[PDB]
Design a protein around this ligand. Sequence first.
Ligand SMILES: Nc1nc2c(ncn2[C@@H]2O[C@H](COP(=O)(O)OP(=O)(O)O)[C@@H](O)[C@H]2O)c(=O)[nH]1
Ligand SMILES: [Mg+2]
Length: 169
Amino acid sequence: MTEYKLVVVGACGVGKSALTIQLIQNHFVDEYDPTIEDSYRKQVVIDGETCLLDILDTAGQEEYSAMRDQYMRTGEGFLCVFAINNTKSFEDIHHYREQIKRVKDSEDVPMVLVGNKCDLPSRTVDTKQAQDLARSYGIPFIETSAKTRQGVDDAFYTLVREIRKHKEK
Ligand SMILES: Nc1nc2c(ncn2[C@@H]2O[C@H](COP(=O)(O)OP(=O)(O)O)[C@@H](O)[C@H]2O)c(=O)[nH]1
Ligand SMILES: [Mg+2]
């Protein structure tokens, strides 16, 4: 069956693990070690296609930089996550965008921008600012809450749709 290799990236504490576990196991985890990097696999149906998602929940630095380059080269699409109450995590998106393009040596890499924690009242990044960034990249932007599940399926399924558009060229 068709397999999609997805990679979830972003600053520590933005909800990469909480998003991934909500997608896979349909519950919200309040505490999950920030240093754990692991992969998950789930069979889903997206637009009538039965497919397997192979999702890498990243944790930042690797023992050797070759491990980072390896997962960036093999990953087919990237979910770039910031938290709407953490401006530094939004600014870090620039770094992930650049680094992924640099390792893949491609200007066209399937990506979706995710503003997570949208259930919280505290917000430092308004929606307009994130829409402006996504527009400059030419990629979709989705606001999510790993806690309420709002937007979670849309974020991952949209990324699959971006991969499919990239492959048909
Ligand atoms: N309120 C709220 N908290 C969240 C959300 N996503 C993650 N968290 C919390 O934010 C903290 C960091 O989340 P985590 O998934 O470990 O972030 P990671 O370092 O990016 O993997 C944890 O305490 C989670 O419970 C969300 O959508 N809403
Ligand atoms: Mg984590």
